[PDB]
Every structure is written in structure tokens, then in C-alpha cells.
Amino acid sequence: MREIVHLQAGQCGNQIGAKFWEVISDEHGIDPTGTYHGDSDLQLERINVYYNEATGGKYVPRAVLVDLEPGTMDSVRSGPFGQIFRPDNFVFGQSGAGNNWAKGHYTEGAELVDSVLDVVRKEAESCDCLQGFQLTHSLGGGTGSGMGTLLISKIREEYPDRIMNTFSVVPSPKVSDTVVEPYNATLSVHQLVENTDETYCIDNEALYDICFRTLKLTTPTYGDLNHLVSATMSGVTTCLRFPGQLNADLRKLAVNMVPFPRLHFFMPGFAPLTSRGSQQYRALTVPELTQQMFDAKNMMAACDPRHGRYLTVAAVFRGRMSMKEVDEQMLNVQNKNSSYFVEWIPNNVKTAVCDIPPRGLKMSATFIGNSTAIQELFKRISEQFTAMFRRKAFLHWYTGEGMDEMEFTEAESNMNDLVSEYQQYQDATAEEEGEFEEEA
Amino acid sequence: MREIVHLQAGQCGNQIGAKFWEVISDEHGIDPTGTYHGDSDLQLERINVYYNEATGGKYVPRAVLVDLEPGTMDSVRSGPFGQIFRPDNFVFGQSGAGNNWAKGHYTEGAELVDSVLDVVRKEAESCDCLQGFQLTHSLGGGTGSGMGTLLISKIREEYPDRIMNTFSVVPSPKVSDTVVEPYNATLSVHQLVENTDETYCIDNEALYDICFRTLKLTTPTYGDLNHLVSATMSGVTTCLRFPGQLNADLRKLAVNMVPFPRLHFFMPGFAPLTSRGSQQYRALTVPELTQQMFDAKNMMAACDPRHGRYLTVAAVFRGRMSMKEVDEQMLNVQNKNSSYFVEWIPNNVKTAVCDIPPRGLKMSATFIGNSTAIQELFKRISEQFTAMFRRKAFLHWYTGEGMDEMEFTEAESNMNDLVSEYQQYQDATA
Amino acid sequence: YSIVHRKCRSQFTDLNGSKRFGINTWHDESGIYANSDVKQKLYPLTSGPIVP
Amino acid sequence: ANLAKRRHAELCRQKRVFNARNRII
Amino acid sequence: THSWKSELQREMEALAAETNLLLAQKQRLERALDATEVPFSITTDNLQCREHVETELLKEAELIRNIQELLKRTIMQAVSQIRLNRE
Amino acid sequence: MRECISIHVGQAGVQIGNACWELYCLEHGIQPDGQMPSGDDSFNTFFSETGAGKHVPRAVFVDLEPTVIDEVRTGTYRQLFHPEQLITGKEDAANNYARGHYTIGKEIIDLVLDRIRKLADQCTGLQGFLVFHSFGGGTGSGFTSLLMERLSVDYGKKSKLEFSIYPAPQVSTAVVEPYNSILTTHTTLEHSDCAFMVDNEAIYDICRRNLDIERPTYTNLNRLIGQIVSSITASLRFDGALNVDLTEFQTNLVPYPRIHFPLATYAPVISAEKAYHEQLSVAEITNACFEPANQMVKCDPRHGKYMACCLLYRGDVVPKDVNAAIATIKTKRTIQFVDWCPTGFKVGINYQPPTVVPGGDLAKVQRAVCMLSNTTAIAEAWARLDHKFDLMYAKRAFVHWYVGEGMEEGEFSEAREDMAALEKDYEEVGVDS
Amino acid sequence: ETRAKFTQDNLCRAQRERLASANLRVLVDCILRDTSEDLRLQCDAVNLAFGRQKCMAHRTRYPTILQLAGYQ
Ligand SMILES: Nc1nc2c(ncn2[C@@H]2O[C@H](COP(=O)(O)OP(=O)(O)OP(=O)(O)O)[C@@H](O)[C@H]2O)c(=O)[nH]1
Ligand SMILES: Nc1nc2c(ncn2[C@@H]2O[C@H](COP(=O)(O)OP(=O)(O)O)[C@@H](O)[C@H]2O)c(=O)[nH]1
Ligand SMILES: Nc1nc2c(ncn2[C@@H]2O[C@H](COP(=O)(O)OP(=O)(O)O)[C@@H](O)[C@H]2O)c(=O)[nH]1
Ligand SMILES: [Mg+2]
């Protein structure tokens, strides 16, 4: 009745999507075959949000998997929960992108998108009242960014009055293993700033930092890395599927968190993360959840919010809890930190409460922060782009595929304008009519 | 309702604090696991003062352990009451200070302090109405002193209207094992002067003398010294957790013991200390407690109050006792010693009474003395600093990482001003 | 030969594998060491100078 | 049975990679 | 009287729901014990045809026997609980 | 033959209506099935008899999301409510006045008005519509803002009583809450008859320090709100020495066209441990209402002047004690009245004591009082909300989310100018002669 | 009082039997999961033992995890 159509782009998007579907299948009580075996009647009240009914009491996800190499599709299919996806929603090309944004955007990603958009349009038209589209991809590769941005642009052209959420795995400063990674990132942010409703920046260095210094795991594999992302994906849309005291859907979160259409880059975090040996020392109640959300270590991006100002903050709590404590902690943090919040928006913090907790817990919380300290990410990508671009390194791979050198210059200019507008919205006074209120 | 946050600096601070936590866990009836195994209902009325709640009725201490060497932290975790501490409250460096003040204050004591202050703010904001901080450290080392002073300074900058107590292990002449000890002591005393509300001086030779000629122990180990320290550490704050006829907390003692803001150095003593042979033959009452708290060998400082004048006295009694004896003995000692007390302050004695006796006893008392006779402790360190500084020995270890020579000169200038003020307030007429 | 005083594996210094045997998916952080039993047996901790 | 062979190879590599003593040393 | 009648009706419907759920789980156990018997015949045929392999086959046979006996005991316990709930 | 039609709009309206209708069913002795257990017609104000003996409420639940109405459709009272009186849209309002007024709210208003007409043609004598909503919400702001307009079009001058959840000065769950408050109370001024206000922060404080609840919830708030509305309607439903209709306190509390904003308080609000200790008489319960710490709106009446007051007593009360208590109230110098209102009170008396519900937090008492008072001291609340609106609007933040849904730019300016004039209206009323 | 005690005793016994049935169902679910896991791991061990025509062709009809658990 409010459906979210899932799109997974590239190898990173495919593995994150497989982990996310594994998470919410156990949330809704779905076996690897597809049928339902649960204990509550509230698990099938709102199940059409992500699932599609089949015969014999089976449910299949409303997801479209996209790749330019069939190996990751084979790996996803041969997984534990790989028999739930419909076989017609795997769209894989035969020749890879080869870590090239031009290959993903003009040469090899221009013929796969008709076949992708056929499935996307049939899944969008099958819904009752569509709520939005979701995308999971990474800006460091070829298939995820180079064809994912083109899919985003075509979807935004076809369905303008909808919601477009994206989960972007932005480049890492220290963990960077590919050389053309700043090229791909800089040529993707110009698309994401122009035709996207919400963007969540997720960073592998921050995921490794949380998996090492908080969870205290000896072996932080990509399964542990993707569980952290899947928890946030579940928590941001739990208010659609489960009842609560104060509901808030993605449209409401976007309205309250996005003050201007060019400012939609958010930072995520997940609240109850503890270790097996150190969970006996901690009672995880609402002050602990708020404390661990607002702790600057817990961000999933490689940006420290102490350097900037929190433009807007939203948080979705899960479980049975009293609303007095929920309102009290979020008033107290704003009263304590007076210089970390912008002063031309009063009550920067939005609260939502859902009733049913996630698997294995009794209470939980999720934090999404629109901060101005995201501009240092774009500044770092720009300073690593210019260093290669002045010497014209790795430029023939891009310019032999129908590209021009003017597109790189315009990408630089729009990234500079983005960081300039973030800086001007940071260093802005609230007690002034500047120049447009000359009507008096 | 009033929470005191514990701070443990260096190896000496870690050992003293571990014994302190063992002692008050035995006081409040907490097993090594963490749960409560007790008999009285007066032990859970005020337990949020030092303990913080967890799930399943567990209590974890409100302590912060800081060290520049992880081996001592491993030993403290491996100790008997080491499984009760939260794992996040241990802060460890990689390379120690190596008995150097400059390493502890500028070089290695600068990258650890953000990590320390994150934990300190984490425990400080969680208290409903925080009362203050207490810190245990030694001035002879490079970690407890050089970094402890900097934490003291930043804590004073951030939380202005609060209380801090310090238990400082001031070094001693005949027990001095470290050659470079007076440099650290000299560079630490001035920082303790400006930014500390109470300082309690603890001397290892005083503890050794008490454990030798009074308790009569063959092997007076550091554990038996730390038990003596922790008895005073508990008896100072007993009235804030247990009810009584006349109550007095840390702030109330600091109001009366401190007549001027440059005068906050005190000497402590504990009353009922007796040996195994002399235990059955001696009946503990208020006269014995009052005579043994004021006997000059009972001090925990390398000092003698006969040379100086008792500026102010604080006595905290524990146990079910009558108030007339408590008033009468402390009036009689004032009457008898009319030359050991100053004349410009009448009624030099503060008294507090707590109803609950300590574990295994029926009556006890703790004495805190503000005297001018503590000035010889500063003068000895000043002369041993000048003796080294006139030959410039061991100076490259301090000046090779950012410290100039004028910091030393202002250090003896500050000590000289302090001891001149103490002499002025000794030789002053009414 | 005595293992009462020899230092054992650290719980705070090197939070990494290849130090403890078997398959463990979380760090130790439990506070129980290898020589704790023999150390407790040889060196008992019973009260202090005060109290009977 | 090829799929089950892939599953058991996944389990075996899981055991080898999660034996942290043998993986690093 | 009406209040007592309402309370008794609520307790009856709770008991009936629990009994139906236990009957469904007993049917699940019955089909599990039904299906756990094919590997026994497979192992018997394998040993008869053959006469690091023999130890695994013997372990399989012992595991099958233990599982079948324990499933029979659990089915009996489920039937007893059903009877008590009905009474 | 007297009836009031309840219109609960928004999630706040639905969650207040659940507690209110549970209270009404338990007062009138009607089961969740909708049938009385075996010639009384006192229920006929709120319920309508069917030939089989069933009783159906005179309520309309309106919402734009299904996740809150489906709990009512599934839960314990799934048989009491009519299946067609629970109206549910889709794709909610997303905290947007423009969405709830011009695009989404315009669709279902025909169905809502059809249901209102069907429920109002059954009433042999109709008193008014009671509208339960919240300013800060998208549905409860935007859809209400044209529900009152179409109600004024369809029905000429029938009574419109309003139960508003005001935004608290400190705690609030939204960001565009000042925009919604401005654009609601700009267009409801000439189209609303009376508006009793309660906010969540004051009820949080009351539940914290009176009912001895350290962690209250929305259920504990809705129970008190239901007690207030039941104390309002008890004079209509039961006996009394002085009985009060709805037109009575729409007339006696609104002295000027732009000021129709009372404040509602209730007393005594005590727990079952303190009810054993404290003696509860008429003077004590009527001084508890005038005490500023028991206000259910976070504003201090000591800053302003009382414009009119309405006291409604329930239970074992006598006019001697009511008169002596009011005379004692009038003489104190702390309590201040405007000089052009020498007669400042209305008094209503009802015979039935308040009813206690299972799971409630109050106690079983013999007498109670509900106060509706109009005070000049809400000018500071309007000034604070003007501060928030102007501070947010000086840079034109969050304005595209309203402009792109069908709202022109000048309506923000005209609404802020209207309330800027309303502040001077309050000042000119408050200035003495 | 005897009638009140009679009804309350009936309610208490009904509640006790309800909790007993719930505990039995949870135990049944745990046992079924454990036996299915053990049987599948044993079958995979036997298959790897053969890996490192008379019997390998016959062992291809091993029931799936769904049949081991009890869903058909
Ligand atoms: N007193 C009280 N206030 C409530 C309750 N539920 C919600 N609110 C208030 O309502 C405001 C938000 O509006 P909601 O009622 O939640 O939702 P809505 O009015 O339908 O608006 P939309 O969500 O956009 O559809 C919050 O600021 C709450 O203060 C309640 O049960 N009691
Ligand atoms: N967070 C996360 N990152 C991943 C995952 N898999 C791969 N990556 C990162 O993605 C980068 C490569 O992206 P790539 O697979 O080439 O994207 P593609 O070109 O669209 O297929 C590598 O640097 C990885 O660190 C995953 O499961 N989770
Ligand atoms: N009273 C007491 N003194 C101690 C203890 N441990 C060490 N000391 C004294 O402290 C001095 C060494 O201090 P050190 O550990 O180097 O300080 P750190 O560098 O800050 O850790 C020695 O001379 C000892 O006399 C103890 O447990 N109790
Ligand atoms: Mg809502």
C-alpha cells in the first residue's frame, strides 16, 4: 500500500542487498523456501511493502539485481537465501565495466538499461500505491556508479513525484584500493546532487572502525560490514511495516530533514552495538541509546561532526518505551551542545517511535544526521581529483569512449559550488534580512 | 544523590585505587562477580555515590584508570577485584614516561588526554547531581604526576564549581629510590596549588613507621600500606553515604579546613590501629580514639606537628556513640594544648558523627589536619631541587622535548612564595 | 619450574588473533588469566592489617 | 548436488578463515 | 455473575488457541519422524552392498537411531500435554 | 434529545478518541460488543440505538495513514465502531500543511462531509461538533484547516468546539511545526467557535509530580484528556443543580472576535497513595485549579490577566462551599482580572462523581472540578512562536516543500502579518482603562 | 468466598497449563532445528568421505532440510 522497489547495483550493491534481504526475511519470519512460519499476527499485516505474493503462500522480494559480470550473480544465487529472488530479476551483462565510469555510463551501460527498466517499470506498475525507489551502490566502481547514476536519472525522469533513496558507499581516504576511484566519485556526485531525494553516505573505513573498536571482533568480514548497513536499512523503514506511537515514513523524514533541494547528504548510525564479553556491564536503555547515537565514533561515514554544525537530526527508536524519556534526552542534548547546532532552525531534532523491536533485542534506535561536516568529504575527493587531473593521468581510458575534457572541468566546478554552499550555510547569521527582503 | 567520580593515575594510583575499591566493595557487600550479597538494608540506600547500575542488578564502579604502561593495567585486571571494572574505563598508553615529567606533561601526555577526557565527560554527565572528583596519584613518577596535573588543570577549566580531592604520594628523604624524583615533585606541587580544592599528603616512610612500631607486622607489604591508605579514603566520605546524628560531606569539610585558597594541604591519621598481641587488652572508646588520632606518630605524613601550629582540625567519627564524649574530648585536647593551636581562629575543630561502624569494628575515627608544620615537606624538596639545579644534572632529559629553563626558576619561585605565606601565617599575632 | 610469576597473554595490549588457541569470534575481555588459579592458590588475599 | 558442494565448500572456508591462529600463523 | 462469565470465556479461548498451536506442532513432529527414516534404509543398503567410510556410516546409523527414539518420546509428551489441556 | 458529534482527526485525534470512547462506554455500561447487559436513554447523547439493541458511537475517525486506524479496526473495540465511520486515506501528509490542505486533504473531504451529514441527520437536537486534533501534525493542521471551512459552508452557525494539542515551548517532534501552527491559526480564526488548548509538556510535568509516574506515556496523557472532555459533557448527560450547554461557554468565554483560546485544567489529579492522606474539599480542588503549577498549558497566568472563567464541578459539592471558595479566590492580590470584567465567572454543578477505569492511574474520588479560563498570558506564547517562525523564515528554509504542492508564496507573509496584528489585539485588550 | 476461590483456582490451573504448553512448543522447535542441522552435516560429511557409482548414485535421494524439519 506504500511500496518500496529495491534496486541493487554492482557487486557491492548485490552483496549488501543479499544481506539486507536475509535480515528482513528473518524479521518477517520467512524461510529460505519463501513461505511463512511465525508466531505473531502483526507480521503479515504490512508485508506487501517489500514482498510480493505468489501461489501456495509464498513471498518473493520486490528487488531488481543488476550487474555487468555474472560471477557476483552466481555467488548471490548460490548463497543461503538465494532461492527467494525471482529468476527474471537478475540482469547481468556478459562483459564487465572494468572499473570505468565511461564504460558504465556510455559504452556498456547504455544497452543493459532498457532490459533493466523493463523489469523496473513492471515492478513499479504492479504496486497499489507506490511509495518510492531504493538503490544500494558504491561510487568506487564501474557498474554501481556508472550505470547506477544513469538508472537514477531515467527513473527520476519517468516518475518525478516519488521518493528516491540511495545508499552510497563513498570512497575511503586510507582504505582506497583502486586508482580511478576519485574519477568515478567526482563524476557520480554531480548526478547524485541533481537528481536524488535522499542520499546516505556509508564509508568502509568507518565500518571497519566500528567493527574493531566497538564490536571487538577478531575477524571483521564483509558479512559483519553488511549487517551494519542492513540494520540501518531496516530501521529507516520500520515505521511503514510496524505500528507505533509516533509514526514517521520516508517522506516525512525527507520533509523534516531537507531544507533545500541541493542538501540531501546524510550520515547514518545504529544504537545498540555491544560486545559479548562487555554486555553484562551495560544496561541498554534510552539514555544509553541516545548516547551511543550521538557519540561521534559511531558515525558510518569518515567525517567528524565536531568540525561542523548539525543542520538537522532525525532518529527512529524501536521497541516499547516511554515518550517522556525520548523527548527529554533529545531536548537535553540540544541544551548541552549549543554551538554544534545551526541557529536559524529551532528544534533541529526529530523523533519517531515504532513498537516492534528488531531480532534479538528489546529496544533499539537509529540516527540520521544532516551535518555540514560532510563538505570535507567532497573537499578530499576534489583535492585527490585535481592532483591526477592536472597531469592528465588515466585520462585516455575515459576520453577514448566518447567523453570530453570539459565534463571533468564542469564536475570540478559543481563540486566546488556544492562545498561553497555548504560553507555559506555554515557561516551564516540568523538575525539578518540580507538583501531580498527589500519589500519593506 | 551526590556522586564522586574516582580517578586513578599511574601505577601507584592504580594499586591504591584497587585496594580502595576492594575495601568499599567489602563495606557495601559486593561480591567479586558484581552482585549484592548482604544482610542490612542500609547498604543500598546510598550506593549510587560510587556505583553505577547495570542490567540484572549489577554495580560497576565510577572509576577511571589511566596509565602509560599496559602491564600495570593487565596486573590490575588480573587482581582479585579486577573483574568488577568496566573494560572501557581502562586508558592505556604504549610507551611509558620513564620517570620523566616532560614525557608525562608534553610529549606522551598530550595524545592520551582527549581519550581520557572523553571517558571523564562520559561518567561526569551521567550523574544526576555530581558532587566532585577524587584522584589518587604519586608525585614521584612520570605518569601520575606529569599527566595527572594536566588532567587536573583541564578538569578545573571545564567544571568550575565542583570539588576535587587528591591523595598525593609526596616523596620522602630516606625512602627516596628515584634520583630524578625532586624535579617531578617540584614541577607538580605548583600545579596542585592553583587547581586543586583539597590535597592530602601521603608518605611511604610514615606508613612504614606506623606498620612497624604500632601494628607490629613482620612483612609490611604495599598491600598492607594500601589498606591503611584506603581506610582513610573511606573514612573521609563515610558521612555522605551513611546516615548519622551530625553529617558532614567533602564540601563541608573543605569549607572549614581551608581558610585561604592557597592553604589546602592536609595530613591524615586513622584512630583504631592496634596489634594482635595488644588487641584483647585494649578497650576501644572515645578517649583512646581521641588520644591515638592526635598522637604524633599516627600521621600519614613525614611531619611532626610540634614544630608547627594546628591551623584547623577535622574529626570524622563512625559508630554508635554519645555526643557529649565527642564534644568533651576534643574540648579537653584544645584546653591542654594551648600552644599547638593558633590564636586567631577560635574553635579550631570540626566534628562529624556517622552511625554505621566500619566492617569488623564498632567504633572508629579519622583525622584531617591543616597545619603549618607541613612546610618542612616543601622546604626539603626545594633544597634538593636547588642542589641538583645548581649543577644542572639530569637537565637534558627535560629540555630535549620542549621545556625551557625558566619553568624551573618559576617553580622554585612559586614554592618560595607558598612557604613564605605559610611562615607568615605561623608567625602572626592576634 | 614455576609458572606462578611468568607473564601471560595480554587482554588490553594486542587485541588480535594468533595468540589464543581454538576458534573465537569475540575478544577475550573476561578478566580470567591462565595463572590465576595457581596465583590464587599460592598467594591468598585475606583482609588486611586492621580487623580480627 | 553442485549447489550443496558449494555450500559445504563455503562452510569449510568459513572454518579455515575463522580459525584465527591458523589463518595468520 | 457477568464479570465471572466473561473471565471464564477469555480463559477458554486462550486455552483453545494454545491447544491448536500444540496440535500443529505435534503434526510437524509426526511428519519429521515420518521423513527421518529414508537415510536409515540408505545406510543399510550401503553397508550391505559394501559387504574413513565405515566410521562415518556407523556414526550416521547411530545418529538416526537416537533421533528416531527421541522423536517418538517427544510425540508421546505432546499427546499427553494435549490431553491435559483438553481436560 | 441532545447530541454532540465527535470528529477525531489525525493520529492525535484517534489516540485521544480511543481513551475517550472507552471512558464513555464504561460510564454508560456498554460492553465492547456494543450491547448493554440486562428504559434509560442517558446514552442517547453519544450512542444511537439500533433495533437489535446495539449502540453505535456518534464519532468520525479521520486519518491519512492506515497504520493507526487498523489498530482500532483489529483490536478490542472492533465491534463497537461502525465500519464506515473510520475513514482512512493513503500516503499520509508528511508534516506538510500544503499536502494536508490542497492536494491530499482535498480528496477525502467529500466522503468525510457525507459521513458528517449522515450522522447529523439522525440527531433530534444537535448541539455542536467537537474536533480533536493537533497543530503540529500535517493531517491535524492542514485537513482541519479546510474541514472547518467546509463545515461553516454546510452548516451556518453551529457550535465548533476545538480540542487542540498546542506545541510545547521546548519539546516538539517536528521542525516545520511553527509553519503548521501559523498556517492553522491564521485560517481557523474566523471559522472556529472555541478552542481549548492542552500541550504535552505540562501534562508530562503533572504526571511526573502528581500521579507519581516517573515515565508517563501517551496513554496516560489521553486518559486525562478524556477525563477533561467527560467533565465538560457530564452536565449534558447527567443531572445537576446548574447545568451547562455548549453555547453557554462559547458565549461566556469569548469577549472579542479574534480571542477564542481558553486554557483547560483539571483537579484533583492525585494517586491512590496520596488520596489516603489528603482531604479533598471544594476549596482545595478550586485552589488547585488557580495554582499556576497545575496548569495544563506551559504558560504562567501570573504574567497576564484573567479575561473570563468557567468552573465545572462534579460530585458531592454544595453551593455554599462553591460560593465561599470563589469569594476567597476573588480577594487575593495574586489573582488578577481585567477591569472591564467585574463579573468574571461561570459555575456549573453536576451530581455524578467521576468514574475510575481499569488500568488508570488516578484514584476513586467524590468530587472534582474542570476549569476553562481565558488569559492574556498566551500573548507570550504567540510571541515565542512568532520568534520561531520569523527566525526560520528569514532565510526561506523549508519553503519549497510548501510552494511545490500548490501554495503561493504570499500566504506565509499574510499569515505572519495576521498574527502580528493579533499580538497587538491582545495588547489592546490587556491594557486597562 | 468458596465460589471465588473455586473460579480463581480454575483460572490459575488454566494459566499454568498454558505456560506448560508454550514451553513444550519452544522445546519442540529447538529439538527439530538441532536434529535437522545434525543430519545435514552428517550427510555432507559422508559425501566428502566418498569424494576423498554403486552407492553415490543411490545417495542422491537424500531428503532436503525442509523434509528433515517437517514442512511438506
Ligand atoms: N497529547 C497527545 N499528543 C499527541 C498524541 N499523539 C500525537 N500527538 C502530537 O501530535 C503531533 C504530531 O502530529 P500527529 O498526531 O502525530 O500526526 P498527524 O496530526 O496525523 O499529522 P501527520 O503525521 O502528518 O499525518 C506531535 O507533536 C505530538 O505532540 C497523543 O496521543 N497525545
Ligand atoms: N561496505 C561494503 N563495501 C564493499 C562490499 N563489497 C565490496 N565493497 C567495496 O567496493 C569496492 C569495489 O566496488 P565494485 O565491486 O567494483 O563495484 P562495481 O564496479 O559496481 O561492481 C571495494 O573497494 C570494496 O571495498 C560490501 O559487501 N560492503
Ligand atoms: N603507598 C604506596 N606507594 C607506592 C605503591 N606503589 C608504588 N609506590 C611508590 O611510588 C614510587 C614509584 O612511582 P611510579 O609507579 O613510578 O609512579 P607512576 O610513574 O606515575 O606510575 C615508588 O618509589 C614507591 O615508593 C603503593 O601501592 N602504595
Ligand atoms: Mg503521523
Side-chain angles (χ1 to χ4, degrees), chain B residues 107-118:
Chain B
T107 298
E108 272 97 350
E111 294 85 4
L112 197 62
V113 291
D114 52 356
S115 311
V116 173
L117 276 165
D118 182 28

Side-chain angles (χ1 to χ4, degrees), chain A residues 121 124-125 130 133 154-162:
Chain A
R121 267 198 293 261
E125 292 300 326
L130 183 74
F133 293 90
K154 298 199 159 329
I155 284 166
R156 280 296 285 186
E157 288 178 353
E158 286 173 355
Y159 298 100
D161 50 352
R162 289 298 174 220

Side-chain angles (χ1 to χ4, degrees), chain A residues 10-12 15-16 99 138 141-144 169 177 204 207 222 226:
Chain A
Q11 163 188 113
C12 171
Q15 304 280 5
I16 296 181
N99 275 355
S138 59
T143 308
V169 186
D177 51 354
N204 271 20
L207 288 176
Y222 283 164
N226 300 334

Side-chain angles (χ1 to χ4, degrees), chain F residues 242-260:
Chain F
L242 283 85
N243 54 6
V244 180
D245 197 358
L246 296 199
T247 69
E248 297 291 331
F249 57 86
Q250 74 178 357
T251 296
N252 292 148
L253 263 59
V254 179
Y256 280 104
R258 317 280 306 279
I259 307 104
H260 50 81

Side-chain angles (χ1 to χ4, degrees), chain A residues 245-247 252, chain F residues 10-13 15-16 63-65 92-96 134 136-140 165 173 177 200 218 221-222 225:
Chain A
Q245 276 164 330
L246 188 64
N247 313 102
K252 178 175 308 177
Chain F
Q11 185 177 12
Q15 276 162 12
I16 291 179
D63 208 298
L64 294 188
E65 61 188 311
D92 63 358
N95 277 9
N96 215 355
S134 49
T139 302
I165 297 298
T173 62
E177 182 149 13
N200 283 15
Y218 280 161
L221 262 59
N222 298 348
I225 297 169

Side-chain angles (χ1 to χ4, degrees), chain F residues 332-393:
Chain F
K332 283 159 19 173
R333 313 179 182 187
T334 300
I335 297 169
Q336 203 171 7
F337 270 97
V338 298
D339 66 296
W340 48 262
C341 194
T343 52
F345 277 110
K346 182 175 174 66
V347 183
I349 306 285
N350 187 278
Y351 276 4
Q352 185 149 7
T355 67
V356 55
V357 295
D361 313 318
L362 289 153
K364 180 178 177 180
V365 297
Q366 308 202 309
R367 47 188 77 93
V369 60
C370 171
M371 186 170 199
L372 298 173
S373 66
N374 211 350
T375 313
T376 309
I378 55 176
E380 61 176 4
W382 297 121
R384 187 200 325 275
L385 196 152
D386 273 16
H387 164 225
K388 277 168 178 71
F389 176 90
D390 283 7
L391 184 146
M392 185 179 288
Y393 190 68

